[PDB]
Amino acid sequence: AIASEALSLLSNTYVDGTEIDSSLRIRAIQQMARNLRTVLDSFERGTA
């Protein structure tokens, strides 16, 4: 689960090319890739 004001950043950019929004885009990318990094092995752990 991702929170509010968390995918709305990942859809479009309400600003025009700001660095803090690059940091704010690389944070949500990680908060959405990390859970995948766990659930891709979780259904291997189910076999254990």
Partner: peptide
């Protein structure tokens, strides 16, 4: 502390006389 190696993203050994136990 450094901030520089993170702001880019977004020798010798002497012997001792000791008492070794495992």
């Amino acid at each position: 502390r450094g901030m520089d190696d993170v702001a880019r993203h977004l020798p010798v050994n002497a012997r001792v006389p000791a008492d070794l136990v495992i």
